[model samples]
Target chain A: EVQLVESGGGLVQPGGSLRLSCAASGYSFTGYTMNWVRQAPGKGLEWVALINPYKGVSTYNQKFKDRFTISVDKSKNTAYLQMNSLRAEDTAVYYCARSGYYGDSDWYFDVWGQGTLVTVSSAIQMTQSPSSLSASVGDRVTITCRASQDLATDVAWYQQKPGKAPKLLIYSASFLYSGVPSRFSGSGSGTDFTLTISSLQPEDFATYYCQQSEPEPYTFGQGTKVEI
Target chain B: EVQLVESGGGLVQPGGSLRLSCAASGYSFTGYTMNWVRQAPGKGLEWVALINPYKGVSTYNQKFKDRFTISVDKSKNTAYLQMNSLRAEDTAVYYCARSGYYGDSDWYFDVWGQGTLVTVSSAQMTQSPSSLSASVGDRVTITCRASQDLATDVAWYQQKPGKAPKLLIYSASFLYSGVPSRFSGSGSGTDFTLTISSLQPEDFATYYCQQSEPEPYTFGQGTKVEIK
Candidate 1:
């Protein structure tokens, strides 16, 4: 089963600008040619760019040619990879591989895509405060994530609403990614976490975020909304 | 996000002969064409067959043209189905959709695959006693299903040696199918069940059959070749 998935990953702040995708699925994607490699966070791989969905042509990596931008769409089999000017060493774990060009004896990067972790932060932050809150339905809410340093519990949260797509209630910190609603929990550790909800139902209002995946760039926070 | 898995399913003994598969993975298996519905068990759907991995043509359903057999392998993007003589109304749950021919309005099945459950049977009877002797490996049940009311439908299985057949018990004494809590099972319509509350040493060799369903088929009568 050939796939390549890789969607837009999370968090970006330093000079912000994102994009990232990779799609393709099960072969003949214009007969191969795609790559974007990354890694950082203990570092190793690097390359950073390529595209050729059958000559829509592209190539980079002269240190990511002033901010990387390779592209390709061949009618949506996808391949993007923008990123422009982000920093914190472009945080890492990108990937998109595939290669197999022929004629120039291409081939390498075999096949990959289970890597979408773009970070690029201004520093360690991840704040999240009262920005908005007013619960009721059975009240009892709580949300926080203060990082800036020791993020032992890697963290993770999320909940968005407004045409949806965020979901994921908690992770590495206090676990609980179930269908959620065990009164929704997740407590503290490393840089103080939190995400209680004890009651509040009525579709639990909206917005939340946390994400902090250990050192090196990954950061998120700044969401909290929960109204009504 | 495009898949299409479908694999070979179980029990077949009414003129026996089976073969099913549908692997494909994200897209472009020669641009599309693959069907093969089925439902029976309460009945409804039944398309029978289709294939056309770029013209390796195939089509059936003339009451499954004497016994189905569509095929396609576009270098293993897979897509096969072979049933031959099987009967008991050809049990059911097949499925493997996905059409998108592009020419000739062919664009239905959208994309599917998450079905696999063939069962052909003849009548019913499940006995067992070619051998039995227990010691350290405790609880066990060589086999049993006298075919009486056949309530929970039935389904048991085990075979170790080179490995493969496994499915400890089903309807008749649930286990959600894992094969060991010290393996257990209980009588349903007729009588005879499995129980291995303490057997170990890799379950000492053989053990087999029960799958009763108004059938001209059953299993049991060879096990424990000698394990003391």
Candidate 2:
């Protein structure tokens, strides 16, 4: 019965620094490792950082090297994500996830914090579409959704890698998790659900998922990342 | 390579029924367990039922215990969810997922099938119980006597069929995102309790407590709240 809740979100101008927090309860603060994941406006999920409170062992995604820091205030059972020199591209929603890393090396995120959205000002937004897609793994794929000329704070996104099951990326327009490129991101308003990803890398050709987080069973877009 | 594809979800009359299938390939069917998960309208994901093709064992979520029959056909390398006496509420999407077991029989779902949507024109909503009566401003402690003591990592969830089950309160009464701080959890050994203060109408839902420390995750039969 462990839990995680993410807090802290706002607009940071390019070049500003920011810190996000995830308050955890129910589990030993310093006994488990806390990890951070995020998504930009239109990009894939990126594993940001992880910190083992008990051992002070911190792990980082190679792409995030030296860009962010993960730490915890064990006394308060809180984990922190501190980022410096933010840029327009740094705008995204961040989530803190927990796992039973005490002894088992298992990493499936059994629990996740809500999410913190950080938007960097001065970032140009892009609107593009791709359906019959065949591109470099890093090729950005953006899909726009419009159901009944409306909108709702209800949206989610996902990724289905070739021969793999779909993995949640953002839920309720924010997130659950993923089997996605590190550059995937989702954003929405009213009813327009937008899925965007940075250029597909050589290993990134996969049928992406776009599901709404409004009510029951999450829905996914029809696709199979059949390498073309 | 592992892949799962769901098919046979379609419109059903209130009294009509249908059995859906999930074709799984790229792995030895007899060596893995397959589970059927469902999402109803405006609801969280529900773990309906699971069958170990290798062992011929089946387990189901209580809510689905009476209706969902999860079975496997090793010869066909497929799993199925058979539903009868359909109601509009039963309409949603279903997926077949694969689970992996670890040391001492630990298990968790990893891969999943693409979903198939079922529409029941007259589906019904299913539900729960508990006799704790309380009003606003009361601690209203609800307890679950587990089978073991020193059971740490107890979590809470609110599940309405056709929707996903959410982790509202977790170990130590740690509330997930959106949960008010007044909603706290605490318990030790096989005894666990979830307390919410000044409970609002929104707080009224059938609640469940699950254990996190135990090798195989398990949940208590759910409890419900009533306004007095």
Candidate 3:
């Protein structure tokens, strides 16, 4: 049976480096392209890196290009991922999948190894205050997010209702998306940021998240809830 | 300004047909591919169809291929999606997005149309039970979906004391990614179903559902599975 068994995992602190290994069997390792995909808790899948042993090439997501590396030792049928300068955002379940070409036109990732979890503990945590709050219509509501390290203006805010996909409210700290009410605003630079509803609308009751994208492992603050 | 304006929407009985329109402006209509994406209430996006006017090619998701068609009228600079034999699963917010090729290698969906809703009404309906009991090691089946006739667009949740609810199944019959092998789902429309091959000690909990096909998001009253 074909198998790609991944190694056990561990935790990494910010500024630390980590290496993960995957052993392949039941197939020629040099014939397939290997991919590393990761998913943050409660988030979607993200392509992290790819290694083509057949072509002797490797690629990484632009965000991880500088700090992530992929390598393989055909002799041992093993693949490796080496990441440096980790951050809280790198906390995710990493999966190694095999990609194969079926003719001239079909290319696909057909097999995946059971994933390994990597918890990147952060020293520069992004914290949101008052996990829950109660407010009424027409009241001015403000939620604050603080980062342990400087984040400049590379921040974003999202609004998520009960079971709906999150909606982007603000980016670059203070710029609101089109159609977002003008009453909803954001401000602050460096490590502190705030999302404010000038006058809360009945529909404004929801959870809000603040995210920082300044460095590797982009991370989001624990959400703050605005309730009725 | 580049803009895509979709049309108003309405309800369609099961097995009925509907045609939706999208008007485009501020760009060459034939230069980009137009895509149709749908989102059932409380669910994620599903790609429905794609039409490339420039290449004169069109494609539909397998589920919709037999009953869906996409067409573009260069003179009107508009695209249309025709859906036939609609089922409850077809109820969703339909959006039109523009897919552009930026060179030989870069491809992306850069612009999107304001979406319109389409509600596929059903013929039969009902509700789940109040509560049930089963012994450990016993096989148990629960019917938590009724009325809306949703297909695999139902989500099941389990809640234990003092803790938040947990998702067990989604899209009606599939486990939430990785769940125990014993929990299985089947059935569609008004007959949403779940089967536990052999109940475990940890299986005693409240099971509720949210059918993804309806508007405003309707949920089950919840059936508590207790020790017998």
The top-ranked prediction according to TM-score is 3
Q: Which ten residues in a row have the lowest lDDT in candidate 2 chain B?
A: B122-131
* Rank ordering of all candidates by TM-score, starting from the highest: 3, 2, 1
lDDT of each: 0.68, 0.65, 0.73
lDDT of 2 at A180: 43
> What are the DockQ scores of the candidates, in order?
0.01, 0.04, 0.03
Instruction: Tell me how far the alpha carbon of residue A54 in candidate 2 is from the true structure, in angstroms, after superposition.
Output: 74
- Candidate 3: docking tier: incorrect
lDDT of 1 by residue, B92-142 (tens): 878787755646442334456777888876334545665677777566665
Query: Tens digit of lDDT per residue, candidate 3, span B49-134?
Result: 78888787887766567899999998998999988877665778888877654222222334677688899873322335566878
**Span of ten consecutive residues with least summed lDDT in model 3 chain B:** B101-110
- Ranking according to DockQ, highest score first: 2, 3, 1
lDDT computed for candidate 3: 0.73
The candidate scoring highest on lDDT is: 3
Cα lDDT for residue A216, model 2? 25
Task: Tell how far residue B55 is off in model 1, in angstroms.
Answer: 10
Mark the 10 consecutive residues where model 3 chain A has the least summed lDDT: A101-110
Query: How far is B209's C-alpha from truth in model 1 (Å)?
Result: 7.9
Q: Can you write out model 2's per-residue Cα lDDT over A135-213, one digit (the tens) per residue?
A: 5654666666554424364555545554344565665554434454457676778756776766656655656545433
Real contacts recovered, all predictions: 0.00, 0.06, 0.00
Mark the 10 consecutive residues where model 1 chain B has the least summed lDDT: B210-219
True-vs-predicted CA distance for residue B217, candidate 1, Å: 8.4
Candidate number of the best DockQ: 2
